[PDB]
């Protein structure tokens with residue numbers, strides 16, 4: 001069970017991919033109603049969010065590969081994998097697969113709203129990221 005979004009960017013695609021490898025950027029930008037994020041080390045996070053009446057606590061690990069970021073996560077609302085894949089110099093694909101059908105049904109519109117927002121505002125978002133991070 002998956003929801004996907006293509007993102008077009010004119011920002012340096014490898015800086016973009018690197019920023020998406022930081023869960024402190026990616027988890028709050030995509031998951032529903034994230035209110036807390038803790039980066040234990042660069043590749044490990046915990047976060048808390050809420051959508052509707054449902055609070056949740058999610059934690060996971062980031063794996064970097066060739067042209068790919070894979071975030072493996074587990075939560076009290078089901079477990080999954082978030083992929084960020086570079087498709088070419090100007091394009092990436094985000095794919096979120098989640099193992100809990102009920103949670104997927106309720107969470108999907110929040111996730112989709114976040115992916116649409118990211119797609120529509122990616123280069124302005126990344127420009128301000130790069131100023132703060134100095135990359």
Ligand SMILES: CCCCCCCCCCCCCC(=O)O
Pocket residue numbers: 001002003031032056058075077078096097098103104105107108111
């Ligand atoms: C991390 C625990 C709460 C996360 C909420 C995750 C929402 C995932 C939605 C995935 C949507 C695909 C399912 C579908 O096609 O209807």
